[PDB]
């Protein structure tokens, strides 16, 4: 029977060590959640960049259309002078 | 007091506490899984941001090319005007 006391006392000590072990593991996991939440904050900067790059694209195309309109007028002016010179060939 | 009853009751208490702590770890483990899902979504967001960056560069390149074509025309025009004024 004295061994029975030894079984329970030994198993209890094992359970209480297993508890400290599970708690220390939970403590580590809590930090992991903390670091990963910190990493997710980097998303705010990421979305801001995407909006900037997206915004700059549209602006570039708008600029491209205006310069096109200007290129067309110049091209037309040029053609008018060349046909005028062409008339005396 | 009854030691065998006292040890028995505490060990049963320890084993219930273990189950309880394990159920909490299972919750945190699922949180970590959700965060890993979100972290994958952040990488994809990073990819989308890079594509927009690339398309921005390509559009800017095109705008610069047409701008340069416009300039070479402005010059051709300038040459014609200096030539035409030479008659006048």
């Amino acid at each position: 029977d004295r061994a029975v006391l030894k079984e329970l006392s030994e198993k209890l000590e094992l359970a209480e060590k297993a508890l400290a072990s599970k708690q220390l593991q939970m403590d580590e996991m809590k930090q992991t959640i903390a670091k990963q939440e910190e990493d997710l904050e980097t998303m705010t900067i990421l979305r801001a960049q995407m909006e900037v790059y997206c915004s700059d694209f549209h602006a570039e195309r708008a600029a491209r259309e205006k310069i096109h309109e200007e290129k067309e007028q110049l091209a037309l002016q040029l053609a008018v002078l060349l046909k005028e010179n062409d008339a005396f060939e | 007091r009854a030691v065998l009853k006292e040890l028995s009751e505490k060990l049963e208490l320890a084993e219930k506490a273990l189950a309880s702590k394990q159920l909490q770890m299972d919750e945190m483990k699922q949180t970590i899984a959700k965060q890993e899902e979100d972290l994958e979504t952040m990488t994809i967001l990073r990819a989308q941001m890079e594509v927009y960056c690339s398309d921005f560069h390509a559009e800017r390149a095109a705008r610069e090319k047409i701008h340069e074509e416009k300039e070479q025309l402005a010059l051709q025009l300038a040459v014609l005007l200096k030539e035409n004024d030479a008659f006048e």
Binding site: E10, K11, L14, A15 | A14, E15, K16, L18, A19, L23
Partner: peptide, 29 residues
């Protein structure tokens, strides 16, 4: 007491264990 089967991975643990030897989960979890 006596040997017990892990309810998660089915490993048969010895009566002296409070966690499963393979998956480390407690007997009552």
């Amino acid at each position: 007491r006596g040997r017990w089967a892990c309810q998660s991975c089915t490993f048969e643990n010895e009566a002296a264990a409070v966690l499963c030897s393979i998956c480390e989960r407690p007997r009552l979890a």
